[PDB]
Design a protein around this ligand. Structure first.
Ligand SMILES: Cc1cc2nc3c(=O)[nH]c(=O)nc-3n(C[C@H](O)[C@H](O)[C@H](O)COP(=O)(O)OP(=O)(O)OC[C@H]3O[C@@H](n4cnc5c(N)ncnc54)[C@H](O)[C@@H]3O)c2cc1C
Ligand SMILES: Cc1cc2nc3c(=O)[nH]c(=O)nc-3n(C[C@H](O)[C@H](O)[C@H](O)COP(=O)(O)OP(=O)(O)OC[C@H]3O[C@@H](n4cnc5c(N)ncnc54)[C@H](O)[C@@H]3O)c2cc1C
Ligand SMILES: COCC(=O)NCc1ccccc1
Ligand SMILES: COCC(=O)NCc1ccccc1
Ligand SMILES: COCC(=O)NCc1ccccc1
Ligand SMILES: COCC(=O)NCc1ccccc1
Lengths: 587, 588
């Protein structure tokens, strides 16, 4: 009912005003709170369909049914006369700061989700702390505020992908009439890294500025939850102390795994080290087959590197395997070598990294194939991309009572609540959720609004679109073909597909490598279950269709919509060849 | 209802079989027709909701109610035993080819719409002819099969746009670590024209191959409709003759306009000439302010040219004007000069075009500003982009009875039918329709299916998305902000907007707050998205997908609950929150 919503909202909000837009008494109270620099949530009752019933329920706390009514941390404070009495008697600031705890909210983790949750909470008057610490990699690499995406993830990865894309831009320019000679142009790794790191630095600073301008307390400290409301923090100087908070948000993310083989930790690196590496990696082996592995190998090859990928079984496990194979075939034809069906056994050091002259070392990699033959080859750099994992045993004392799953991620309700009722988890550590930066940001902002502004909207985790930024990009939204066939049966699935050629590729001189498909359910009006595209700018192509899939688009919706010409994306609006027909999809 | 549909379908279809998927007698008839290379439409009665009623109405034509039933040009031909008799007796070929007319379908015009209509019709057994002729420009330019888009429109202009985009890619490469020096690289116009024209030639050839492989008769001839079923054709040798057809599709498109001033036709050019010009235009004046004018001026400046645009009043009349101004401001900041509020009065010739040394001429342009002050400046090339118009007085004898509107376009019903019942019109000459290549293609294909395969689906001309390929691209779908406010009033319209910066622009040191997007929404209809607008790179790829959601009636809530893809430009549409009425700044 309305009544129990109102109780949760009053119990949880830090400072909240129940108001009406046309009442000059509420306006007087608003302008008072603004002058006093008091931030607060506002619930305009004349804009809610059942505002009348809420007014009646307020009296259960305040014994009045009029507006405005101000509350602070679950307690009714007063109407217009009473609030102005406190203001003119210099008693207001003390009353709005009265709290059982040091903070209304403590966020452990200053990354994609945690910074978004903390900033949104502060907008409603929640007194908020954000804790962030970066544990250094085995070789000592560290970085600033903002999380995995900002520092060692989406941002530097896509900037180095762009540096690689520009190599083919240089090649194409000749065919379009420009006088340069591609074969006499080379790439400088450290010039690239300096520009990438300068941009990352501007983001570290921007987040510190944003927290200060929202009155958020930023602590560069390692946090550990030792009881439901107590966080122990450890300083850069090993000073230990305890702060208290009403609500706690866990948002500490993951770090790369290493295989348990000799030499891995000592002599290899991960993506954590790659994006600030002060020397060109040289001849490189990438071990693994995830989107991180393939994206990194792809741009290293495009910058002119000698690059090999060691694949245990398949590419992109969990993605549509037809598409995954097309991705890998393109890379193999464009200068990435693959050691297929192969695992490593040991990494042996032949030459130590020369920090002084800014040169890599030299390594001997020993491994074996599934047919039993041995692998043995020398590389200057070895990069492990074999998955990521959280380390919540560092963050969470067992006695607090927060349940984890077999993988060590937090088990949450559909509103991010843990098994401890004031403790929530968002981002990559929330078990079962897509591990993506815009998912973490939406979860964090929406959760802050439910805690401190009386919102009810949940985050929707279904049909979240993705893009893999390999040399030829792969965008997807919804089910793979194999998952749909498993779920519904082969006779209830129809697949429309086509090759295509970007117009930009005609003058630049391949005809049939770009490819797209719609996987559809026959018995549900040909509903689009999944969309897949391999081609340039695949993330821009895919994004808009994710809205239509969210709304339940059918094939007839795609047919009746008209294309924009000339584009790659328009090919989705005229698809007609089915896989069951056996007709070729080539252009 | 059903009976009126069945009569229209039987009267119009060239060759059609009424069938069921489970009937082995129907399968035997299908096999005979395929072996005799007889193409036909097929309607599978067991797959239609009212298949039982259709089966019963068939008796009004054939006096039977079973399947299969074969018809040819409105006449019942027979059941399974009868079709096999004709086949065994070598009588079937002559039956299926019997006609009052030379062709089931004559398409006048071999462009985007006409080629699509003709190929689709031939798939259902319609005996089809496609007529195409290119009247040369005043200086003599002509080109091959395929229409305006293929030869002198979307295809060459986007390729030249891409050559222009690559100049900034060469600049950006230095910041991302590559060793080149952009300052020492120049552009060769004729090398780019040769590559563009080689691709256009492959399209000309590909369409001739497609018509041959579909058994469509291609006539390189100028057509004139002289009665409802008679088309007069004129040869390249000026031989005149008459062919007849049951259905007629008019698909002749438009050509560029010239202003009525001295020297315009003699010494200027249009887009028709630009895309195959053998020499670089040099210092260029573009007169006009359409998307054609701005796209051409944009790429010429990026290829190193000294370019001025003469604007009579505003940019992009009929497009959202906040967006049009941001487009123009970006071009003016990046090396396009504008002569604002200005029109030309005369072009004088100072040098003839130098065909020997492959060089432009030289012209003196005189004009005046709206306050009366004078304009006078020299240019090597003057391009007119002041609109396009059809020439239907050449295509259509007045006595046929096809009604035209005040602009000379064809007045059609919602199924493309003109005021003459067997005559239809598609593409740019269809009055009131968006003038775009994918619209012409959808209209031609859907019409051919209704004429020859019993389809009922109409083309939907509402909320068709567009993209202007200026140096910074502008994509749009739906109403402009000013049209939304005019239609619903200011109090019922909410606008969400934001600047943004492509991630690719950060290390390249490009501008922070020039790219821009907005959603124009209707408050009283669950915040329905009435219009979407984006200025930024790859704007056509950004916009296309959202056109499906707008077709389905997307609201602001649907954008909010959808999660973004990171890092992209398009994801900024999923988190918009600043409203124009709040007064809050949209900068990042
Ligand atoms: C190479 C790579 C590329 C990626 N590319 C993309 C992409 O293109 N698009 C996309 O959507 N996603 C991408 N991702 C995923 C994206 O980075 C993550 O989903 C996102 O960063 C998760 O956000 P988060 O808030 O859960 O955690 P994080 O961003 O990892 O932030 C958690 C923070 O908490 C800190 N912390 C940990 N323990 C403590 C403690 N005890 N006390 C204090 N602070 C602590 C961590 O050091 C870190 O700073 C990529 C990931 C990688 C590794
Ligand atoms: C510079 C420019 C750029 C454009 N860019 C785009 C773009 O990016 N995207 C987009 O969607 N649209 C674009 N367009 C619009 C697009 O070209 C048209 O909407 C489309 O070509 C219209 O097709 P149509 O079939 O109506 O006519 P057309 O393609 O013009 O074909 C008509 C054909 O009929 C021929 N013909 C004329 N009279 C006769 C006759 N009597 N007998 C026989 N044949 C005859 C003509 O010579 C021509 O070949 C652009 C147009 C221009 C001018
Ligand atoms: C960059 O995209 C990485 C990602 O994790 N995308 C979502 C996904 C979920 C489940 C299986 C495959 C993919
Ligand atoms: C079933 O997968 C067999 C396999 O060897 N996959 C690895 C790979 C495939 C295609 C291109 C590059 C690498
Ligand atoms: C009302 O419009 C007045 C006008 O002069 N528009 C032309 C123009 C505007 C912005 C940049 C370049 C040209
Ligand atoms: C009001 O204009 C609507 C329209 O669709 N105009 C045709 C066109 C649009 C965009 C780019 C090029 C051409």
């Amino acid at each position: 009912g309305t009544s129990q919503w109102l109780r949760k909202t009053v119990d949880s909000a830090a400072v909240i005003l129940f108001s009406k837009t046309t009442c000059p008494y509420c306006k007087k109270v608003k302008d008072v709170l603004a002058e006093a620099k008091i931030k607060h949530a506002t619930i305009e009752l004349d804009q809610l369909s059942n505002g009348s019933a809420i007014q009646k329920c307020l009296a259960s706390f305040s014994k009045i049914e009029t507006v405005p009514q101000m509350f602070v941390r679950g307690k009714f404070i007063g109407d217009s006369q009473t609030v102005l009495k406190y203001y003119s008697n210099d008693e207001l600031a003390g009353i709005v700061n009265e709290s059982k705890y040091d903070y209304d909210l403590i966020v452990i983790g200053g990354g994609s989700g945690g910074l978004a949750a903390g900033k949104e909470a502060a907008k409603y008057g929640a007194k908020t702390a954000v804790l962030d610490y970066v544990e250094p990699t085995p070789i000592g690499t560290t970085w600033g505020l903002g999380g995995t995406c900002v520092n060692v993830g989406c941002i530097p990865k896509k900037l180095m992908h762009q540096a690689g894309l520009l190599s083919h831009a240089l090649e194409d320019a000749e065919h379009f009439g420009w006088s340069l000679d591609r074969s006499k142009i080379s790439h400088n790794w450290s010039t690239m890294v300096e520009g990438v790191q300068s941009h990352i630095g501007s983001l570290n600073w921007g987040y510190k500025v944003a927290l200060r301008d929202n009155q958020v307390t930023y602590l560069n400290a390692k946090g550990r939850l030792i009881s439901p409301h107590e966080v122990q923090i450890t300083d850069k100087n090993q000073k230990v102390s305890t702060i208290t908070g009403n609500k706690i948000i866990l948002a500490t993310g993951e770090r790369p795994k290493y295989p348990e083989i000799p030499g891995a930790v000592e002599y290899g690196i991960t993506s954590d080290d790659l994006f600030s590496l002060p020397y060109f990696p040289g001849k490189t082996l990438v071990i693994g087959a995830s989107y991180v592995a393939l994206e990194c190998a792809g741009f290293l090859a495009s910058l002119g590197g000698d690059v090999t990928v060691m694949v245990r079984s398949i590419l992109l496990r969990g993605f549509d395997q037809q598409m995954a194979e097309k991705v890998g075939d393109y890379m193999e034809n464009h200068g990435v070598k693959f050691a297929k069906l192969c695992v490593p056994d040991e990494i042996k050091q032949l030459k130590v990294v020369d920090t002084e002259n800014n040169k890599p070392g030299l390594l001997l990699v020993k491994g074996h194939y599934t047919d039993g033959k041995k692998f043995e080859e020398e590389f200057e750099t070895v990069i492990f991309a074999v998955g990521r994992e959280p380390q919540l045993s560092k963050v969470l004392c067992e006695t607090v009572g927060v349940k984890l799953d077999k993988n060590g991620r937090v088990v949450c309700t559909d509103d991010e609540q843990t098994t401890v009722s004031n403790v929530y988890a968002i981002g990559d550590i929330n078990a079962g959720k897509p591990q993506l930066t815009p998912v973490a940001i939406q979860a964090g902002r929406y959760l802050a609004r439910r805690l401190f502004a009386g919102a009810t909207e949940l985050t929707d985790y279904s049909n979240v679109a993705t893009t893999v930024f390999t040399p030829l990009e792969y965008g997807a939204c919804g089910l793979s073909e194999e998952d749909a066939i498993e779920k519904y049966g082969d006779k209830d699935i129809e697949v429309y597909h086509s090759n295509f050629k970007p117009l930009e590729w005609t003058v630049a001189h391949e005809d049939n490598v770009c490819y797209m498909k719609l996987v559809c359910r026959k018995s549900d009006n040909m509903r689009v279950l999944g969309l897949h595209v391999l081609g340039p700018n695949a993330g821009e192509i895919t994004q808009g269709y994710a809205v239509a899939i969210k709304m339940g688009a059918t094939k007839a919706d795609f047919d009746r919509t008209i294309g924009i010409h000339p584009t790659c994306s328009e090919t989705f609006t005229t698809l007609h060849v089915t896989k069951k027909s056996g007709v070729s999809p080539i252009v």
